[PDB]
Amino acid sequence: SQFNWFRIGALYNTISKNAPITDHLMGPLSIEKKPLSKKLGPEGSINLFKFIIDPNSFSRSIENLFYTSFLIKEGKLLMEHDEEGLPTIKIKQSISHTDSRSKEIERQRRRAAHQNHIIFQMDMPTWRKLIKKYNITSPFLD
Amino acid sequence: KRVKIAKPDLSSFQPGSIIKIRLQDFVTYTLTEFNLSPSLNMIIGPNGSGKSTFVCAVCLGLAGKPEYIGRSKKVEDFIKNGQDVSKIEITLKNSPNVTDIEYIDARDETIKITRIITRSKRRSDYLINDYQVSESVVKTLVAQLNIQLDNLCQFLSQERVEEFARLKSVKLLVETIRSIDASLLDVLDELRELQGNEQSLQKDLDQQSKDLETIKAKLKEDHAVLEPKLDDIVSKISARFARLFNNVGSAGAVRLEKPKDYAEWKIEIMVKFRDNAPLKKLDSHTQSGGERAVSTVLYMIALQEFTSAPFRVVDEINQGMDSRNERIVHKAMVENACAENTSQYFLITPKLLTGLHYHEKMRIHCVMAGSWIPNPSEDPKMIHFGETSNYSFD
């Protein structure tokens, strides 16, 4: 309450805006009542026998299983038989089908096919046995 | 050129929202597609015509089960009579803040969740980007999206509407203390009981003199820590209550009365929508049904921006409340939808209301079928129900 709030108000509504102003008396007062795997590439495959063992750590096998763990939930993982007659580790492409039931049809197709659980893939004796022949084994993922 | 449907780009849509929904082999709808507005959604149709069935299917798709929504369990109702499998697909925006996901990268913006119901198989098997998973994964994803099914705030059903109708102040205190961490209330109750028993030992005394000072100091420190947070929360919720009740032309605030005993703190709601009704706690018998429904709906709306849930679901809400209270709550819903980045509500209108207000942001969906209209499956443009942007390019 220091500035002229009326002089500006007097300039407005009078000089400009040409606004009609009327008292409009109280006429109605008096109203008459009127009465995840982007980097990986699929085609490579290698034996898994030292893919699991690492001289550094025993848990290296678990991270190898962790590669399967991402695929365990839907079960798309399937490794193919090489000359030894046992599944061989390889990388998997991203796969997609038309509708949500089409891939479901795909998964129960793989379950219907023969499953590779006759012998647990990681076993002690053969890994040493292959080391003695060619000393190759080796992991492709680390 | 060839007609192209609008691109379901999830980047434009707000996170946690749904663009396109696919409904396969359901009651009177074997092939249907639905488009949902980013701001807010409206579905028009009589109850029992499949609209409620479609909403329940959408709810069950995201790790939902019929008995976890406070309603009877009928799996066979969803399955089309004759068809083996009934399928619901729901797509949501993805952000790098949720773990335990299959096939979907963190930088990816798409989460596709599919639920299938079949008669022969009795198990909980869902699909994430078309990959079969147990219900545990989808359930923990739903948990990590800050959206809950059992809790009545995020999802509202007929039984939940009835439960809110007769709501006590103790329940308001419980929901307020469960929204924030509830450990503070438990600690303060422990301290107040310690104060009571210490005072009892003090009057018994009238080793004890050393007590009642450390206890009171700890109580004062706990109260000093607790007071400002709930004070600001109560002020914010009261301001939201007032700004949501302004359209009703009524004044109301969510007050937290705090007696000396911490457990005696209660919640008061001020009512002014009816001049005859005095200011009192919400209750069904004294107040009218429509005004109470509007008040509780507005209270639900107020506790939405603070919550991190992507959206809220309300059922049996647009059914007429006196055609006046329902009109004002629709006006409030329009005003809320005017603000951007708001939750999407799946609205249900069992009874048609004359002269309904339709905002430009929201879009109405109709599921009714006409005799002269061809079958939806045979007609390529009839698969979409209550959608107009699909016909136009982009």
Swiss-Prot record, chain A:
Q: Which gene encodes it?
A: NSE4
Query: Which locations, inside or outside the cell, does it occupy?
Result: Nucleus
Its name, as the record gives it, is Non-structural maintenance of chromosome element 4
Q: What superkingdom heads the lineage?
A: Eukaryota
Q: Which family does it belong to?
A: Belongs to the NSE4 family.
**Purpose of the protein:** Acts in a DNA repair pathway for removal of UV-induced DNA damage that is distinct from classical nucleotide excision repair and in repair of ionizing radiation damage. Functions in homologous recombination repair of DNA double strand breaks and in recovery of stalled replication forks.
Give the record's subunit note.
Component of the Smc5-Smc6 complex which consists of KRE29, MMS21, NSE1, NSE3, NSE4, NSE5, SMC5 and SMC6. Interacts with NSE3.
From Swiss-Prot, chain B:
Q: Which domain of life is it from?
A: Eukaryota
Subunit-structure text: Component of the Smc5-Smc6 complex which consists of KRE29, MMS21, NSE1, NSE3, NSE4, NSE5, SMC5 and SMC6.
What function does the entry list?
Acts in a DNA repair pathway for removal of UV-induced DNA damage that is distinct from classical nucleotide excision repair and in repair of ionizing radiation damage. Functions in homologous recombination repair of DNA double strand breaks and in recovery of stalled replication forks.
Where do the annotations place ATP binding? G45, P46, N47, G48, S49, G50, K51, S52
What sections of the protein cross the membrane? Answer: none
UniProt PTM = Sumoylated by MMS21.
Give the comment on domains. Answer: The flexible hinge domain, which separates the large intramolecular coiled coil regions, allows the heterotypic interaction with the corresponding domain of smc6, forming a V-shaped heterodimer.
Family recorded in the similarity comment: Belongs to the SMC family. SMC5 subfamily.
Q: Where in the cell is it found?
A: Nucleus; Chromosome
Which organism is the protein's source? Saccharomyces cerevisiae (strain ATCC 204508 / S288c) (Baker's yeast)
Q: InterPro entries given for it?
A: P-loop_NTPase (IPR027417), RecF/RecN/SMC_N (IPR003395)
Q: Which Pfam family, just one, is annotated for this protein?
A: SMC_N
Q: What is this protein called?
A: Structural maintenance of chromosomes protein 5
Additional observations? Present with 892 molecules/cell in log phase SD medium.
